Amino acid sequence: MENDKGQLVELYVPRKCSATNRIIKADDHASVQINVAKVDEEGRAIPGEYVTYALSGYVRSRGESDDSLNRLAQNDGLLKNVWSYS
Amino acid sequence: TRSSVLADALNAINNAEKTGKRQVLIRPSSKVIIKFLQVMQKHGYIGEFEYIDDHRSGKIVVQLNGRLNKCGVISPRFNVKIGDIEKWTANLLPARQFGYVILTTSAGIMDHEEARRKHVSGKILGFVY
Amino acid sequence: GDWITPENLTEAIIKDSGEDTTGSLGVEAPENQVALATGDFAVQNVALQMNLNLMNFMSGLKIKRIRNYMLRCHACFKIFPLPKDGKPKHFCASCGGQGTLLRCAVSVDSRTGNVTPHLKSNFQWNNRGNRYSVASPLSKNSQKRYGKKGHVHSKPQENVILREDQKEYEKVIKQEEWTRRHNEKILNVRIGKGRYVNSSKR
Amino acid sequence: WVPVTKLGRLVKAGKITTIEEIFLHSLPVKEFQIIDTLLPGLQDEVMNIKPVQTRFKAVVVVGDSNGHVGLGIKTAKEVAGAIRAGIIIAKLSVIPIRRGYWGTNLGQPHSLATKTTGKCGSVTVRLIPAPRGSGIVASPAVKKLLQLAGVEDVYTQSNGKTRTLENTLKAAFVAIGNTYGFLTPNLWAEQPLPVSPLDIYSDEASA
Amino acid sequence: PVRGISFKLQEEERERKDQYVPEVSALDLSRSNGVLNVDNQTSDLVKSLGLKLPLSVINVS
Amino acid sequence: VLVQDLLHPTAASEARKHKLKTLVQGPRSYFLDVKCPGCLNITTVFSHAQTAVTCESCSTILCTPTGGKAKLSEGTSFRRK
Amino acid sequence: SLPATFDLTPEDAQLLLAANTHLGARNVQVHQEPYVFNARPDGVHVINVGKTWEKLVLAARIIAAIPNPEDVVAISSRTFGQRAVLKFAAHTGATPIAGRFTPGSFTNYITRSFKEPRLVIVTDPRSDAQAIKEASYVNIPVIALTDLDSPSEFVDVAIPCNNRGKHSIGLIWYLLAREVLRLRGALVDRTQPWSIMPDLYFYRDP
RNA sequence: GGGAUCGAAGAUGAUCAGAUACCGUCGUAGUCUUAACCAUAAACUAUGCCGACUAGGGAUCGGGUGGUGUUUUUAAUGACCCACUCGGCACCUUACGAGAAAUCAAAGUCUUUGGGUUCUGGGGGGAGUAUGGUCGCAAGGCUGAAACUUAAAGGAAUUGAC
Ligand SMILES: [Zn+2]
C-alpha cells in the first residue's frame, strides 16, 4: 500500500466498525453512522460538533446494535448507569 | 476421548472470533497452549490472557481484539526439513508477506521466520494469519 | 336444576339476560316523592350514588345498599362496568394490559356514594403460558416463509393479534357482529394463544 | 438530466468530484448519469446473447482498466434493447478492486494482494497472486472480466459446472469484490471517521 | 361524511375539533385523591432513584 | 452478550449453577454437631450420611438415609459446624 | 458529561408513574432483560424508569444534531399514536407519516410519496416493520419506542416504555418534543415547565 | 402336545350387472406350545461410533435442592404450586452458516481445504446371472466375474396444452 519510494498506492482506506473492528465494504447498505450533539455548558446543543460511531450491517441485523451502543456511549460521558460489565 | 488439547483450544477461538465476541474461555490448559498463545500475542493478534488455577489442569480466559482471521492446527505433526519450509508456507498462507507457520524445534517453539534466522528445523504445529 | 315450562319461558329468557327477575337479589339493607323499581344493576348503580330512590318492587321497600359484580384490572387497579354479554373484554382500556381484567365483587352505598371491591385474601396467582417463543417479522427465516408471490390474500401470512388498535383486530370485531346477524336470521374466534401454548400439538 | 435523488443534485452541482467519496461512505447509487460523469473512461463489452422463447437475454461487462468493474444481465424483446438496458444495469453495480504485489514493492501494483474465492450455484472460482510477466491464466470469459478491471498477473482455479456461463461470471465477480473485505496488518491503524458530504452540503442537496 | 370526499366545511371543523384540551389534566393527582396507588416493588424502585413522592402502597400479595 | 466479564461472575449467578460448572469446583455439603435429648455427648454428622448413625453412649439412632440429605430424628438438636 | 441539571426531576417522575409507563406487561424477550427492575408476584414486570430517562435524553441529542429539521420522519400506523406524531411534527419541523405506509417510499423514486430521510423514529417496531425493513436498504438509522416484548433487529436506540396504554404513548412523544426544543434555543430555560399540556397529545375516541 | 378362531392349497355356488367388478360355503398345512434348525425385511431417522464448540424459551418423564407457599391433620410423609439443577423422548424460535434444491442444531465450525477411527461407491445394461469355495435336512444364505451391448439412465424445483 506504499511503493518502494514510499508513495501511497491505495485507492481509499475503508472505515472499520467501532463495535467489532470489521471492515465496512462499499456496498454494506445496512451499515449506519451516528452523530451525537455536543452540549454547551449553558445546556444547548453546539452546531457542527459531534461524537461519532459506526456500525456494520452484521451487528445491526443480528440485533446486538442497541447493547453495543450503550457500552460505547457509557465509556464516553454520554451515559451514567445504563450498561453493566457483569 | 480428547485426542488433542491444542486442537480444541484453537477451535474455540475461531468460533468466538467469527461471531464477534471479545472474550473466550478454554479448558484445559497445557504448557504447549501457553507457548502457542505467547507467539500470537507477540505479533499482535490477541490481547492479554489469564490463567486460573484449580489443581486440575487449569483454565484460560483470552481477550480478543478483532485482528485474527484464522488459526488452526496441523495434525499429524509431520517432520519438516529446512528445504521443505518453503512448501508449507506456499500452501497455507494467503500471501508472501504476512502470516506465520509455527514449529516445534529443539531450540524451542517459534514461527517460521525466526527459524530461518537461527537456521533450525523440526516439526510443524499450526499456523496464524 | 329448575324446570323450564311453557308458562315460565318468558321469565327464564329474561334471567338469561342477567336481569334480576326475583327482586332483592344481593340487597344488603322530600320523603318518598319519587321512586324507581328496576331489575338491571347498570341502572341501579347510577341511581344509588346520585342519591336516587330505588324500589324493591318484590316487597315495597327502599334499597340503601347492594352487592353485585364488576370488572377490575389487576395491573392498574381500575374498575370497569361489566358488559352485557357477561364476560371480560380482551384488553384493559386504561393500561392496555392483555387479559388482565378479572370479575370482582363490588358493593355500593347511597350513604357514602363510594364503591368498594371485595378481595379474596388467599389468592394464588397462576402464571401458566405468560412467556413463549414467537416469530419475528424481520428474521431471515420469516422472509423466506413470506414467499415470492407477494401478499397472499388467502391464508394471509397470518400475524398474531397483540394490540388493541392493531388493524387486524378491527376486522374481527365487526366481522363477528356480521356473522351473528346472518346466522340468527338464517336459522329463523379467539385471540392470544391460551395457557397451553407451550405444549406441543400433534 | 434534471437529477431526482439527493446524491444526483450534489454531483451535478460539482460538490462531489471523485467516486472514492461514494465508496468510502457506502452510499447507494440510483441514477446512472452519476457514474457517467464521475467515471467517463468506462467502456463496455458484450459477453453473450441468446434467443429464448421470442426474447433476448444479454450479458454485459463494463469497466476501465484501472480498478473499477461492473456486471449486468437483462432480458428484453429486442437485441438492441437488451444491450441498451444491460449497460445501464452494469453501470449501477460498479465496485472497487484492491491490487498489490507478489513480492518486493517495486513500481506500481500488478497483482492481487491475497487469495480470494467466490461461489454462485455449484460454481466456485479461486484467484491466486502471480509473479510478474505471467499474464492472466484463465478461460476466455473470465479472462475478459479481469482485463477490464486492470489486473495484469493472476492464477485461477475453478470447480463445479463451469459450462453454465452466468453462474461463472457472478462467482468471479464476487471473488474480486472480496479483495477489499480482507483485513491485513497494514490496515490495522486507527482513523477518525469522516463526516458525510450529505451533512456538509445539506442545503445544496435539498429541493 | 363519506370516504373519498372533502370540502372546506369539513376541513375548518377538523382543525377546530383536534385543538381540544381539558381544563384540568388527566394526569393530575387531583383526580386521584392526591396520591399514587402502587405496588411494593414500585415503591422500591422510587427509593433506589432517591426522590420523594406521595405514594400509596397496595400489597398485591 | 458480546462483552461480559468472565473472571468476576456475580455471587448470585454463581450460586445457582451446578457444582461442577462453577468457575472452580467445590462441594456444597457440610457437617453438623448433633445432640440426643438424653446424653450430653455431642457427635459430628455428615449432611448426606448414608449410614444410620447411632449415638456413642447408646444405640439410639440420630439419622436415617434417603435419596439426598439425611433425615435427622425427632427431638435431636443440631448446629451447623 | 451533561451537568446535574439534566437529572430526573421529581415532578417528571409523577407524570411517568401516573401514565403507567413503568408497567412492562409479560412475555419478556431475552434482550431487554436489562431495563427490568423486578417482577411482581402476579407476573407483571416493573421497568426501570430511571433508565428510560437516560435513553430519552440521548435520543434527543441525536435528533438535535440533524442539520435541517424536515429530514426527521416520525411514523405511526397504529391509531393511538397518530395524533401524537402529528403534534410532534408541528412543534418540531419533522415530517409525519400516519396510517398506511405504502411500500417503496424510501426505495423506488418515481413515487408520489418518495422521501429521503436522515433519521426515522418509529412508535412500534412490530407493527411498523415495513418502515424499518426498507430503511435498512439505504443506510438510515432508526430510533424506536420499545416494550419488553419488542423484537430488536435493526433498531439502534431503544427507549423502554409501556407501548400500549393511550396515555403512555402520548406522554413519551410529548417529552421528546420538549427536550429537542430545549436543547435548541426555542425554550429559554430548563427550570421552567412548558406551557403546553400533555393532554394535547392524547388520543380522543368519540 | 394342542387344535376355539381365522385360513396359501383343495372341493364347490353365480357368471347377471360397470360405484358397490370381486363375491358365497366348507376346509388341509399353518396360526399356540416343548426340543432342535434357518439368519432374511422399505430389519427406515432411507442419516456409523467417540469428543469439543456455535442457542435461546417453556411444556413433559426420572432424581435432587430451596420456599414465611396450599391441602390432607394438631406433626412426618403423600398430592399440588413457585424457583433452580443434572439426564431423556420431542417442540417452537433463530442462520454467523451449509446446500442443486426440497430443506438442516447438524446435513454447521471445508479452496480460509488436517480432533481420533471402522465400512462402502466410481455412467446405464448383461447380473446378484455363470463358475469355484463354504454353511444348511431342505428351501436357500455369504463371497462373486467376463465376453458382449448402449448415449444416456437419474435428482430437485418451475409453467401449464387437447
Ligand atoms: Zn389495566
Author numbering:
A (entry chain a): 1 to 86
B (entry chain b): 2 to 130
C (entry chain o): 221 to 249, 261 to 419, 444 to 457
D (entry chain R): 35 to 87, 96 to 249
E (entry chain C): 65 to 125
F (entry chain f): 2 to 82
G (entry chain P): 2 to 207
List sentences quoted exactly from the publication behind this structure.
RpS0/uS2, rpS2/uS5, and rpS21/eS21 form a cluster of ribosomal proteins (S0-cluster) at the head-body junction near the central pseudoknot of eukaryotic small ribosomal subunits (SSU). Previous work in yeast indicated that S0-cluster assembly is required for the stabilisation and maturation of SSU precursors at specific post-nucleolar stages. Structures of SSU precursors isolated from yeast S0-cluster expression mutants or control strains were analysed by cryogenic electron microscopy. The data show how S0-cluster formation enables the initial recruitment of the pre-rRNA processing factor Nob1 in yeast.
Enp1-TAP associated SSU precursors from the control strain were predominantly found in a conformational state subsequently termed Enp1TAP_A for which a corresponding pseudo-atomic model was built. The global Enp1TAP_A map resolution was estimated to surpass 3 Å. Conversely, base pairing in the central pseudoknot as seen in mature SSUs could well be traced in Enp1TAP_A. In addition, all r-proteins (except rpS26/eS26 in the platform at the 18S rRNA 3’ end) binding to the SSU body, including the S0-cluster r-proteins, as well as factors previously observed in yeast early cytoplasmic SSU precursors were found at their expected positions (Rio2, Enp1, Pno1, Tsr1). Several parts of the 3’ major domain which are thought to mature at later cytoplasmic stages were still found in an ill-defined state. These included helices h31, h34, h40, and an incomplete and distorted ‘neck’ helix h28, the latter resulting in an immature head-to-body orientation. Remarkably, the observed density for the H45 loop supports its arrangement at this stage as hexaloop. During processing of the yeast Enp1-TAP particle dataset, we observed at the SSU platform between Pno1 and the S0-cluster r-proteins a previously unassigned density at the position where Nob1 is located in human SSU precursors. Yeast Nob1 main contacts with the SSU precursor were found to be established in Enp1TAP_A particles by interactions of the insertion domain with Pno1, of the zinc finger with rpS0/uS2, and of the C-terminal domain with rpS0/uS2 and rRNA helices h26, h36 and h37 in the SSU platform. The active center in the PIN-domain was observed far from its substrate, the region around the 18S pre-rRNA 3’ end. The obtained density map for the Enp1TAP_A state also allowed to trace the rRNA precursor backbone for 4 nucleotides downstream of the mature 18S rRNA 3’ end into the ITS1.
